[PDB]
């Protein structure tokens, strides 16, 4: 029962920077393979038999190791290298490691916050959803807080996040508070608050059910 543990779980590197990730085997193994997978695509062969580069893999990549510890290294980080990397046992049961996520580092960026009241169309049908977008920010870390008439709300809130935009390398996030027409009509002020490192003070956006 060989277990493959990869480190680190997630890591970011600046362009031109050297990066190394590791895969540790609970027991000794003769060879290790590596694959690269990008959101929405199938895994692509990257390194095989510890140090051999698969077809379609740039020379900046290299692999090393033996026994219980192996590594994959990028001599100089490039945007297109942002992906998830999995190590794999070379023989039965062909077990994969849990993967390591490599992101491209970039200058910090505060999020652009937008809040949207429920559309008239949804209201006329008896429903009410409030949406907030926290767009193009950098360090994925961010916290969203909803406030209705000043009081904080924790439930009925669904969030979703995008991966690094291959253009600006930022992240985006949406938060949706779902309610019935009545739940929404009972209160007046709706606020979406974002707390990001790029700000000591949370970014606030709001609207009044009536007015706004």
């Amino acid at each position: 029962d060989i277990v493959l543990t990869q480190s680190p779980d997630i890591t970011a590197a600046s362009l031109g920077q050297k990066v190394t990730i590791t895969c540790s085997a609970s027991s000794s193994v003769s060879y290790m393979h590596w694959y690269q997978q990008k959101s929405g695509t199938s895994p692509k062969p990257w390194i095989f038999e510890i140090s051999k580069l698969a077809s379609g893999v740039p020379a900046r990549f290299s692999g090393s190791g033996s026994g219980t510890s192996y590594s994959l290294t990028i001599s100089s980080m490039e945007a297109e290298d942002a992906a998830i990397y999995y190590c794999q046992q070379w023989n039965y049961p062909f077990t994969f490691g849990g993967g390591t996520k490599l992101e491209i580092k970039r200058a910090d960026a505060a999020p652009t916050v937008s809040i949207f009241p429920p559309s008239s169309e949804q209201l006329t049908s008896g429903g009410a959803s409030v949406v907030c977008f926290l767009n193009n920010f950098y360090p994925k870390d961010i916290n969203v807080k909803w406030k209705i008439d000043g009081s904080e709300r924790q439930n009925g809130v669904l969030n979703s996040w995008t991966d690094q935009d291959s253009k600006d390398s930022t992240y985006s996030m949406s938060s949706t508070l779902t309610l019935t027409k009545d739940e929404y009509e009972r209160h007046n002020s709706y606020t979406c608050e974002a707390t990001h490192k790029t700000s000591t003070s949370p970014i606030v956006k709001s609207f009044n059910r009536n007015e706004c």
């Binding site: 895994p43 062909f94 949406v131």
Partner: protein, 214 residues
Amino acid sequence: GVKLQQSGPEVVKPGASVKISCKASGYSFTNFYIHWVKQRPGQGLEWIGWIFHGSDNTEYNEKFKDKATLTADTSSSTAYMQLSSLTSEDSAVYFCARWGPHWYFDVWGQGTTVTVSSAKTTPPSVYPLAPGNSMVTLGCLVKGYFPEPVTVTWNSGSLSSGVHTFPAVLQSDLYTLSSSVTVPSSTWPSETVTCNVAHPASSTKVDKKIAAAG
């Protein structure tokens, strides 16, 4: 080149079974092994087993014996994987791969998505999302549909830069997602901005113009 074509997306109810296919082209098929790999939503990779052109010259991950049955049709160079008595734990994308000459999974299929659910095919309700100021951000809420996926475009694709479409979330067994588009304030409401949402499974496509007011 060496290619493996996998079957389309499947929606199957709990307890039912499904058979996925992986057709090989560009090679002697029977000269290499075909492996199958599973990947649950947002999780890692799992090896299921392999077949070496012999409907039962197979090898399985112990965990998958009793779940997956691998077969092959040399007359068409096709590998099949039948998954029985499906449960929600079986919802995942399944990939097939060839065990190349250098002995590593060298060519991969594009993956087949399997969704195990008793939910009914339902089109999304599409709602426009209107704002406020300089580079302006508009949105489109696509709520209560099943199954995945939906395709969202803005102005039929005229607006591609500044567009963000978020991954869907599942609630009450139905999916909901949103898409945002950012444009110069000099563009909207000056000009029309519309979101187009296509949902193949329900054969529906809707256009929702973003109008002023909130």
